[PDB]
Amino acid sequence: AGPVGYSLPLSPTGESAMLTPPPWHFSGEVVMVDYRVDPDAARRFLPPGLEPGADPGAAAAVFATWQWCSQDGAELTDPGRCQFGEFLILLSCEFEGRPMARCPYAWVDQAVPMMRGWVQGMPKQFGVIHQSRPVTVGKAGSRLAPGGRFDGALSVHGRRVVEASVTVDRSTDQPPALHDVPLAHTLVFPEWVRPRLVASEVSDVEFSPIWTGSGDLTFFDGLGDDFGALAPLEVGSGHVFSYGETLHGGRLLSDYS
Amino acid sequence: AGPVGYSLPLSPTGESAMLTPPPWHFSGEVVMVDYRVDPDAARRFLPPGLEPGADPGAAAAVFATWQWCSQDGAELTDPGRCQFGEFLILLSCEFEGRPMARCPYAWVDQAVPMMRGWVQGMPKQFGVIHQSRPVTVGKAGSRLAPGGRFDGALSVHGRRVVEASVTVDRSTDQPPALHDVPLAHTLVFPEWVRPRLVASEVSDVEFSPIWTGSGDLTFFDGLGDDFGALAPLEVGSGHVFSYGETLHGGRLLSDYS
Amino acid sequence: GPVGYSLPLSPTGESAMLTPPPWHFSGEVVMVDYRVDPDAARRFLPPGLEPGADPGAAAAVFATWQWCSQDGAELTDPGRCQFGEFLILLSCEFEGRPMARCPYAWVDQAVPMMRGWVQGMPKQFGVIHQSRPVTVGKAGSRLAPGGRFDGALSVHGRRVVEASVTVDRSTDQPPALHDVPLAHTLVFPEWVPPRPRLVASEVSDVEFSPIWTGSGDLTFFDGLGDDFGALAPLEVGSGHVFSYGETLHGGRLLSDYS
Amino acid sequence: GPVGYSLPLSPTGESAMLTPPPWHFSGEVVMVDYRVDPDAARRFLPPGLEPGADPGAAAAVFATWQWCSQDGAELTDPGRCQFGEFLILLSCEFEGRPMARCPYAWVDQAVPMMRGWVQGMPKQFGVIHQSRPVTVGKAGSRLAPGGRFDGALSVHGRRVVEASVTVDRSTDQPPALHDVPLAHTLVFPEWVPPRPRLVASEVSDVEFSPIWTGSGDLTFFDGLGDDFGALAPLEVGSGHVFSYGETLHGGRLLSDYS
């Protein structure tokens, strides 16, 4: 009885909900830089149940642009509804001996993806996110080929947060490690009037060939010392590739009870 | 142990959270139109526990622009962080004989207010929201005085949803009824791996003198038949005024258990 | 005194909003050919521009671009070098030679908008969305038979145009209206109390990818006035999805009406 | 052929992005007076514009505006008639008479931006935020002693200027640089292979509210180049918060350098 829906707003038929129930399909383009983080700083961002990664200092800065849709594909016919840009930080960790990634910070530039992020425990905030695109004709850009350069930038509240650059020098069939492991999130929502460690369950994960080369990464101040603690000590390889996956729901790792 | 925060993202000191804990202060400018809704349609948007209003057909369309801050006032020094625009629909209802308002739909144009809305059970989505401002010098606008006209508009996904207009003809000290009663929301968040009816508890509610006159309201298609069921049968008086309140937290009306 | 290719002037010239040409462009296009009322089209042609050998041929063109100056500097800041665009093209001729007239265009960045007016190209501001091909996963279409691509323009929070293309084959035949000179009217409003010039944009190094062609669909909406509405499609033809590059060098005078 | 006050031309003239003047403006201003290096300021003055009786006087000006044409039509669509602005003013004189030079301005809507260039006003695009007075509740400042008001400009996702004013009294003395003619350089880039004109914006019905004045604070950031940076404050003076109206009619020629 009364109005219903997968999410707010509730409505008599359920059609009004901002979010659709999973599964959701994603197809995107990524510009990523591997980097070295202070392992002791990283540890502070891992909740109970998540241990330091096998390489505790391994981190990544990830820019992506996405199209997404529900099972029926309906969103694809309206490009404004199905596209968004994203930046995230990944930290290496483990759950019961199994490699995973912790995402301590993420930004996107559309509201549906942001809220859907919180549904999963992924800590998405809003930002302005730009990313180079490969070209195949003309001179105004870079090709996916040796010598090709690609850049990403994130600003929040009108100031810069991260800039990244990659100049690729070869193609491989080796997915970057932090982009090829489960993400372990903390599901929690502010009390108005019981956090859980969850993994996002995915299927049909697909990578294009990976273009790899030099990486560059600059973090800026503004977001606070907690975020700055994760700035790079050293910057590693950059990677440019296409990525797809289907996201089904959450798997409980720990109730803490 | 591990990272903490009022909300995501969690961080070692808690400083990174997107949201600050309540209370939050609001100061805004409102352009509102009273209207008559199909009472039977309205009833479908009321969850168990909420009965039809004493005047079941009374509704309102409300445009507002706001500044807000936490108790320490910190957000006020960065206008980009403390301002947002909003449009909402209000329906008249009652909880145990006491008049309240149900907000079945709301839109805002900033991410913090949107998420904070879901914390309260208020069904905020994202939109583009415009609203006339009174002027006191020159000719390019209307004064808060007899004959003054004020307009509001909401577009979502690049198409119009609502347009409203008010031409004021007198000032009163009578707050519009639907803007002077508690809001009863449904607190619910999508399951990833138990709705509650709550009232938002407010204090220090303050209205300027109310400028009242003719109202006009146009709803457009696009958002679905559920939303369209709430379009006006007849349009009543418009009101232009300033409003302040302090929002403290939620009060449980019903657990349904 | 201060100098610059454009405003703002500054002591070294570095502050100018616009850089001098040439400028390079690399874009992704979703285009639909259509039939326009020939009488309506004629009314948008200024003196010197005559009706096309096919007076009713028109096109609706969505594109996303990267651009840069000769030194390539803008490319390192994606926010500075990218923009989206929608434009209408009408078939015409000047002194016996086929050209295209752009009576309306919209973009979503200020530099391209002003640079348009420098050329006589009538760019206004809008919100412009366009599907992108995907190569992995399920959330999109491949550039392959059956792939669908959509475009939308809204202005002042209202729909103006929606277009869609479902491609069915690849060709090496660039769409006619996208492979002729554009003839613009270079004119600026008089601020201190005329003198329009008909000018063509001079381009080099024009390049097309293979052209994916199929069915086209186009819908115009009301709101922008009866003048724009007069160019609404009577019938909709083929759609095309392709990549495009050119270098834009400056203008050449077609007529100054002297 | 098609006509219009500005592009796009159309059969009836209705499609033009800009309407002819006069245009009315009603705005809310947060302004900070400051001291600029006089040598730096001189380098931004074109021929005919000479240093101010006080060469070092400058101002940083945040404003939010509504505007409309003579018929008032734009007022009914708030999205069409509103914009935000930040500008720098420098003190100067022309033929012995005090004026202001605006070497840099930013706005957040396309119509005002293009209309600026029509006048020779060097408007670019930016993100501009400004505090608003409140009259109820606790989330803001009143226009009263102790009230604080802030402004910020970011361009390409980087800070450019932050300003703040804490007012302590009301006066009937309009800020000097906001109460003189603006002398602009009307010039457009040559597209077909000069001829700048020094022009003043002709205004009438200038009106100020009472002026709330107090302490001023101003911070410039790097990023826009050494040319803009040269106008950074050496010292910051008084701040002012007030409402402003004017009607802008057209341009008058100061010099065409012939």
Short key terms for the protein model shown above:
homotetramer, 257 residues, mainly beta, Acetoacetate decarboxylase-like, 13-stranded mixed sheet, 4 helices, ADC_dom_sf (chains A, B)
Write structural notes for this entry.
The structure is a homotetramer. Chain A is globular. In chain A, strands 1, 2, 3, 4, 5, 6, 7, 8, 9, 10, 11, 12 and 13 form a 13-stranded mixed β-sheet that branches. Chain A has a single domain (1-257), classed as Acetoacetate decarboxylase-like (Beta Barrel), CATH 2.40.400. Chain A is mostly beta strands. The first copy, chain A, contains four helices and 13 strands. Chains in contact: A-B, A-C, A-D, B-C, B-D, C-D. The interface between A and C is large, with 43 and 43 residues. Chains A, B: Pyruvate 1 binds at residues 116, 120, 124. Chains A, B: Pyruvate 2 binds at residues 159-160. Chains A, B: Pfam families: ADC. Chains A, B: One of its GO terms (molecular function) is lyase activity.
Strand content of chain A: over 45%
Shape of chain A: globular
* Helix/strand order of chain A: EHEEHEEHEEEEEEEHE
Which two chains share the most extensive interface? C-D, 62 and 62 residues
Task: Tell me the name of the CATH homologous superfamily of chain A.
Answer: Acetoacetate decarboxylase-like
- Radius of gyration of chain A, in Å, reads 19 Å
**Which oligomeric form is depicted?**
homotetramer
Number of domains of chain A: 1
CATH architectural category of chain A = Beta Barrel
Q: Largest sheet of chain A, if any?
A: 13 strands, mixed
Q: Which structural class fits the helix and strand makeup of chain A?
A: mainly beta
CATH class of chain A: Mainly Beta
User: How many separate helices of chain A?
Assistant: 4
Binding site for pyruvate 2 (chains C, D): 158-159
Organism (chains C, D): Streptomyces hygroscopicus
InterPro entries (chains C, D): Acetoacetate_decarboxylase, ADC_dom_sf, Endura_MppR
Pfam families (chains C, D): ADC
